[PDB]
Each structure stands twice: as C-alpha cells, then as structure tokens.
A paper describes a structure:
The homozygous p.N478D missense mutation in MTPAP causes spastic ataxia autosomal recessive Type 4 (SPAX4), a severe progressive neurodegenerative human disorder characterized by profound muscle-tone abnormalities and optic atrophy. The mutation diminishes mtPAP's polymerization activity, leading to an alteration in poly(A) tail lengths of representative mRNA transcripts, which dysregulates post-transcriptional expression and results in a pathogenic lack of key respiratory–chain complexes. In chicken mtPAP, the corresponding residue is N472. To confirm that the reduction in poly(A) tail length in N472D mtPAP was not caused by compromised ATP binding, we solved the crystal structure of the N472D mtPAP-ATPγS complex. The structure was virtually identical to the WT-ATPγS structure with a well-defined density for the ATPγS and no changes in the conformations of the surrounding residues. However, the second adenine ring, which takes the presumed position of an aligned incoming 3′ RNA base in the WT structure, was missing from both protomers in the N472D mtPAP–ATPγS complex. By itself, N472 does not determine specificity toward ATP, but its mutation to aspartate is implicated in the human SPAX4 disease phenotype characterized by drastic shortening of mRNA poly(A) tails. We propose that N472 plays a role in the precise positioning of the incoming 3′ nucleotide of mRNA in relation to the bound ATP, which is required for polymerization, and that the N472D mutation could disrupt the regular substrate-nucleotide alignment and cause a reduction in poly(A) tail synthesis. Observation of the density for the second adenine ring in our WT but not in the N472D-ATPγS structure supports the prediction that upon RNA binding and slight domain closure—N472 but not the D472 SPAX4 disease mutant—would form hydrogen bonds bridging and aligning the two adenine rings.
In mitochondria, mRNAs are polyadenylated by mtPAP. In our work, we purified an active form of chicken mtPAP and determined the crystal structures of the mature wild-type (WT) enzyme (residues 37–568) alone and in complex with ATPγS, UTP, GTP and CTP substrates to 1.82–3.1 Å resolution. The purified mtPAP crystallized as a dimer as observed in solution. mtPAP consisted of an N-terminal domain (NTD: 52–194 aa) and (using the domain nomenclature of the DNA Pol β family) of palm (195–341 aa) and fingers (342–527 aa) domains. The palm domain is composed of three α-helices (α6–α8) and a mixed five-stranded β-sheet core (β5–β6–β8–β9–β10) that forms one wall of the active site and harbors the catalytic triad conserved in all members of the Pol β family: D237, located at the base of β6; D239 on strand β6; and D319, which belongs to β10.
Author numbering:
A (entry chain A): 51 to 126, 131 to 245, 256 to 527
B (entry chain B): 51 to 126, 131 to 245, 255 to 527
Write the structure that this text describes.
Amino acid sequence: KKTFTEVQTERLEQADRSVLIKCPSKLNEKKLLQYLSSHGKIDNYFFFENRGIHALIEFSEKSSVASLQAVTGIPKHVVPYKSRLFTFTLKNPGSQAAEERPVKISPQSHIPVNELIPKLCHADSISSQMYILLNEYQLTEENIKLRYLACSLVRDFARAYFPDSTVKPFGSSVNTFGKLGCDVDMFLDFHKGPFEMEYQMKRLPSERLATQKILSIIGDCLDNFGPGYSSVQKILNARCPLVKFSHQPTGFQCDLSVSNSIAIRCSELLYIYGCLDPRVRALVFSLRCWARVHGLTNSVPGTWITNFSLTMMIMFFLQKRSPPIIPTLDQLKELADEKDKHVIGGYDCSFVSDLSKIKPTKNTETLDELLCDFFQYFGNFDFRKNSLNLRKGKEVNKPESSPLYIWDPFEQDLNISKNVNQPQLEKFVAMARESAWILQKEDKTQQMINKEPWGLAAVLIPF
Amino acid sequence: KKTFTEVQTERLEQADRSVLIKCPSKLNEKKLLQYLSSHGKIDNYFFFENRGIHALIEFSEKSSVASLQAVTGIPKHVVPYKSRLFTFTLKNPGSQAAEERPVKISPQSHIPVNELIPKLCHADSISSQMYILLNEYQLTEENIKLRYLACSLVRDFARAYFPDSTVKPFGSSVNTFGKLGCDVDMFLDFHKKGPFEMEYQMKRLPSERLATQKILSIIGDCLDNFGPGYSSVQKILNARCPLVKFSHQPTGFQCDLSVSNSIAIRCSELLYIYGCLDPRVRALVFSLRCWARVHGLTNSVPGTWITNFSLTMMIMFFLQKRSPPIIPTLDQLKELADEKDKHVIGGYDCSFVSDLSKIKPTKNTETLDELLCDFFQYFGNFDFRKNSLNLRKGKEVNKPESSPLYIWDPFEQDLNISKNVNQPQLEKFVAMARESAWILQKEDKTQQMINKEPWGLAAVLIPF
Ligand SMILES: Nc1ncnc2c1ncn2[C@@H]1O[C@H](COP(=O)(O)OP(=O)(O)OP(O)(O)=S)[C@@H](O)[C@H]1O
Ligand SMILES: Nc1ncnc2c1ncn2[C@@H]1O[C@H](COP(=O)(O)OP(=O)(O)OP(O)(O)=S)[C@@H](O)[C@H]1O
Ligand SMILES: [Mg+2]
Ligand SMILES: [Mg+2]
C-alpha cells in the first residue's frame, strides 16, 4: 500500500514533468498527441474546460518539457518569463486534414446541491445516499494532477534562489477529504585540498521575517511574471504568513504559506483515517455538506466552526465507537518505528506510516446509524465541561475557557476551535438536535411515495 | 583594431569562465594557483584590495568553474544561491606563517588630484601632462575584467527567471573614456518541425515600459534579499530610463541596471570609435572631464549641472570642427555603413560603420597644447543663445528649442541631451573656460617651473 509520503513524492515528480496547453478552436486530439509524443513518451493526459479547451500533458521524462520549450516562441510588450503554459494554434489553418471528433471534458467541479437532492431521493438506503454524494463531490484523478501542477508551477518561481525548495500541498487537497472546487493549500518547504572553500551567500534574518520577505517577493512574481495569477493578496502579518491568489489556467483558489511541517503531519493523519475505512470519508462529506447547508460553516473565517474543526469532531466521534472505527493518535504513535519518528518545534508528531501495520476495525455499523448517531451524540455532548482529545480518544476537562475545545493533537498547547463563540456552537447543537429528530421520527417509505426528501436529503435542506 | 561588438563578445566569454575568491589572511600565491589549476588551466589571474584580499581567476575552460563548484560547500541561515563567489580559508590556520611575496595588488582606483598635480608639474610639455593623467586615470586590463565579471554575475542572477538573458555593459565602462572608480552601467538584454505554431502564455501589457519596471523591481528585490555582495539597492523605476542602482561589494563597483536600451549602446560604440581613432581624443576628454570636476561644473548627483556625457559630446563636436577634422561626423560614418552595419531602433536610424580600417585616418597634426587651450577659447566664445551642437552634420545650427545649452542627441534626434542645464551653470562653464584660456595664453611657463609653481594642465586643474 502507498504511504502518504510516497504518494506526495510521486505526484510531485509527475507534475514536475507536466504542462498545460491551450488547445486550438477546432481540435484534433490524435494529431496533437502524435505531435507532442515526438518530444517524448506521454504517460497521461486529459482535457478540461476553462474559458476554452485546455489539456494537461504528463510526459514520462522531464527532458520532454525542455525539448518542447525549445521549439516554443514568444508572441511578437510582454514579460518574457517562460513557464510550462502553452498556446497551440495551426500553422496553416487551411490544412485541416481529418474528421472532427469531440473531445471528452474531465469535469473539475461538483454538481450543485439543488441537482444533487433528486439523485439522493431516488436511492435505496441512507448509506447509498452518502456514497452518491461522496462520488459526486470527491476529487478526481484529473483534478488531483491539476492541483499538484499548480504547486509545481509555484515551485519553479521559488527555486530561482532556493534550488532545493519544494511546494507541497496540504489540507483537504491531499488528505482524502478533498472535494471538487476546494482551495489548494500550499506551503513552501526548504529541506579536498588545503583550503576550506565556501560560497558567499546572503544571510537571512530570523524565521518569521525571512518567510515574510520570501512570500512578498514570490507574491509579486506571481502577480507580475506569472501567467494566470490574479487577485494576489499578501497577508504576511497573520499568525502564519500567507499569500492568497487565484490561478486561472487551472481555476483554483490558492493559499501559499511557508514551512509549516506540523500541518502536513495532521494532513497525513487524516489521510490514514480516510484510507482506513470508506465510511469515514462518506460521513465527512455528508456532514461537511450538512454544515454548509445550514450556515454553520462559511467561506470567510470568523466565529463559525471550520471544516477542519468539524472534520476533527467527526474523527473523535469515530474513535468513540464500540468498537472504534479508527484508532487513536496514541495508538498509532505506539506502532511507530524510529523511521516514523518525527519531532518538530519540540512537539512529537510521530505515528505509523504503513497502513498494513494497523489493525483493521471490527466495527460493522451502517452509515444510517452513524449519521443519526453523530447528530444524537454531539446534540447531547456537554461542551461546557468536556473537551475533545484525539490522542486519548476521550472526553476530558477543558484546559481553558472556550465554548468549543478540541485538543490540537500535535501542538497540544492549542485549541483548534478557539475561534468558535457560544452562539455558533449553540446553533450547531440545535441543528444537530433537529437533524437527529428528523431522522428518528421521519416516515421514510411514505416520503419516497409522496415525492419528498428523506434520510440524508431531508437533513440537507434548510429548516 | 577589433570591432566594438567583437570586443564585447570576447570580454563576456572570458568573464563567463571567471570567478572571485576571497583569499586567506596569510596568503600563499603559488599554493593557491597550484590548487586551483588542478580543476583546469588558468589563462589569467590577479589580486586586488577590497576590504581584504580578493583574487580574480579566469580559467581557459568554463568546465573548470563547474569542477571548482563541485568541491565547494555552503557555510553552515543563508540563501543557498550558488554563484561564482568563493571564500577560501586555511584548514589548519596556526600551522603556518607562509606569507606571500607579499602579493601584488592591482590598483582599482586612481590617485587623487592633490598627488597627480606634482607629477604633471614635473613633465616636459602640456601634451605629456595630459598623457600622464590619461595613464593614471584610464581603466586597467584588470579593472575591465572585473567590470565584465560584475555583468556576468548579474546575468547568472537574472537568468534564474530568464534563462536566455544577457547583461551588457554600456557607457564609460566600455567606450574607451572610462576612468578608475566610475560606475558600471548595465542593461538587461533578451535573446519548428510539425504542424503547430507553439507559443508561451504571457501577460499582454500596455507599454514595454511597464514590463521593464516590473522586471527590475523584482530583480532589485532579489539582489537585495537573495543576492550575495549586493547592498544599497535603489529602485528608480520612474525615470526616463527605468533603473536600479546598487553597490556590489566583491568588486566594489557602484552599478546601474537598466533594461534593453540598445540605443545607448550604439552611442557607446560611437564614442568607442572616436576614442580608438586617435589617442589625442582620449587624452583631451580625460583632462577636460577632470577640469570640470575640479571647478565644480560637474557633480556626482544630477541636476542643473553639465554632465560628463554632455561634456564629452561637446568635446566630440569640437574635434569635428578642426581644420582638418580629427574625427568624422556621424553622417560621414553613416555614409560608410553597409547593410550589415545598418540598425534601426524604435524608428530611429542608428546606422554607422563598425570597421575602423574603413575610416579615412585624420590628416590633422595639431598638438594637445593647442587643442586644450583652443577648446577653452572655442567654447568661451561660442554663441550658445543662437547656436546648437549637431554631431551628425558637425555644424552650428539654429536651436530647435529654447534651452540655454542645446546638444542634438545624435540618434534620438529632437532630444536635447543637455536639456537639464540652466543658464547660471552654462555661464559658470563659459567663465571657467574663458579664465582657463586666459591662464594658458598669458602664463610664463618656464618661469612657473623655475618658481616651483603649477603650469599648463596643472595650472587649470586647481581652483581659481
Ligand atoms: N487551528 C488549526 N489548528 C491546527 N491545524 C490547522 C488549523 N487551521 C488550519 N490547520 C491546518 O491547515 C490545513 C488547511 O487549512 P483549511 O484550508 O482552513 O482547512 P482544510 O482542512 O484544508 O479544509 P477546507 O479547505 O476548509 S475544505 C488544515 O487541514 C490543518 O492541517
Ligand atoms: N541625458 C542623456 N541623454 C542621452 N543619453 C544618455 C543620457 N544620459 C545617459 N545616457 C546614455 O547612458 C549611458 C550611460 O550614462 P551615464 O553613466 O550617466 O554616463 P557615462 O557615459 O557612463 O559617463 P559617466 O558615468 O558620467 S563617467 C550614456 O553613455 C548614454 O548612452
Ligand atoms: Mg483547504
Ligand atoms: Mg558610467
């Protein structure tokens, strides 16, 4: 089985030797690939629709990019920054010499709620509803390659002066809980004679200020040299210095931070839980959707619960099952060799990487029960006295006054849901309580017969 | 003699395979070159003094740089940008007192005025004074290699984002009129089987002016934050020519980085021709540049003052007007230019002969004694209010615009290169020329030598 870190390395290596080609108006697929193949073998490719037809081409060898860049020219007022974004037109527009087939468009966004509801209503069980949702919403192989490519393009800027750099995606994009249309969270990562011979190199300041200057410049580069980047927003003074930007070629909204290797460990953690049992993913997607539908989450930050916080609450829920659906963080820590040992900023972030080594769950609860039980469980959870600990998998006394306390499983000084206020917590608790009520006391078979919402769909519409 | 463009290409190729090594405190020359030679043959090298001992090493093969970079490490924080700047220390510092010869230091600056004056007084003719000055002030072979290396390093740096880039020096650094301690003017220059026209996505901007501004702004910041040796980085992006100024500590040069101004190069080649044509040309410019500085007619900061470039062009016009001319007019060079020497840039014709052998050598035989005094006499009595200087025609013509001092930009015509100059400064110039000419005419040379006093060039190179 593929370990998180193996998958990152592979995906990055693939995106490394990938390019984006704005295709001709009247397009011939075969002639294009035949032509491109002349520069080297093509492992994968696909087409998508983003203000015209674009194609992602993944070569087998990185040299194929160089080869292809050789024959590529500048449109003779531009900034001559040469990246892996191409525009292909015909030399002789009047030499079209084959039948026109239509190309398959890989979708890059999910169907909206209003269209999803019908499909859910026409399913058999609530279990199947959640799996329909999961399939309609989850990242596709294509979308993923496109996410890693975005990172790969941003990497190329940074390497100008930090040659060993990488830009690594973290968060929902890579932890199996990613849905179509979600943002790409990126962080920039940096790691004889009679003479001692050293390069002269400019010293940097302390961590935080170096970060700020590096991002400020890279931001400006994206804004001024980089094709496709718009709405570049420097938020350098946050707790984690950050640059936000929109990347039009791939259509992703993006977040670029520096060197937070703790967040990665948690992204790997969530990846494990996501990979362990398909019910885990199914449940997160439906409940993330639920939260959005009732206005418990928001696109902008504030007093609301966040998807990440909500996700962690769901992980705690699954830890508490009889028997558990997923092990505690400590239980993974207990199975970690010294090769899986990582200590970062003083904090232990050690846990098993190999998935085979984990004892598969004996739990057999259906998603029907788990969904309603989630609403029941947190609807009757004493938030004022108890806090969520994912290391121990137990309710414990709150170390601090905060309406909703969830123990940051790595930087254990912290409350990840610290932002949440009492009002929003209560609106969450009331929605859970109403939600659980609806599922318990609804007459399923009659709703189907009446052409009405039931199960998942019933709770995925405003009250 | 080689052609401007041939010389640039060669100098750049040499600087391409050159490096800088901050040397040990107690240095052994032989052991160092012996060691460095292991990585490949060394065509040239020398040492200079810039806050400690540095050495320039020019290998015969570019691979020697790669070889040497292989064994070089990072100082164990820093920006890991690997360039051609090295620091060499001793593994066992207290196991040797092997001081070198001590090593010869190639000077990189000229002696000051106060020391130069004696040497001038001690010469025979005014002609010889000017040539002493010329030799004391002009660029040395070493300083030149160091200038091209600066450009070569900035090139590599720029090439981080723009792999096909080149950085070319222009101005006094390469037009034969360069003196020790003058700034390095650089400009950044940019240089199908199958059924497809394949082209990059790039942002379409309004003018080429804006691209320039953004490219320099970023490169400036990169020099400031990531680049080794660069300090005092100043973005002057809104000038007539967008510019970044910076100090480069390894070579100790103050530098000016602009983008893609291939007109200025043509004028740098023009001045190179005039400089190469006759040694009196260079001699006269150096002495008169020095003269101007001494009397406060020029300044280090820009403003109402005449500039060295403007002053240089005035001297070129003077030499055009001789009987017979010491140098041909720009048009006369334009007339001798083949279609290979034809260049049209931004609409402007900048065509003129490159080959120096093709130009008719001057029949003029005036001595520098006469020319110097005649310069002061000529411009002291020049009607600046009516007449303007045209170096294409080599003639006084009516001023196209109200401006105290008008000199026709020989390429971008309908520009006045001395536009900045106001009436007061022009007059202070005219008065200094008039006094200067008077002193040379009515001075009793032999008596001044006998009296242990300044004479000729030295007489006019001290405040009045
Ligand atoms: N308070 C926090 N405490 C610990 N880690 C955090 C916190 N906030 C964000 N992170 C980490 O940063 C990653 C990305 O942040 P978010 O984009 O806000 O959330 P997300 O997991 O990516 O899900 P989305 O983007 O809302 S669908 C999270 O997955 C965490 O690894
Ligand atoms: N007012 C100007 N008008 C036209 N061209 C100019 C002007 N100023 C500078 N240039 C051009 O830029 C080149 C370099 O500018 P400068 O560094 O200011 O002068 P310079 O020739 O290097 O002599 P120095 O540095 O004063 S000794 C000049 O040789 C011109 O080609
Ligand atoms: Mg995210
Ligand atoms: Mg200069």
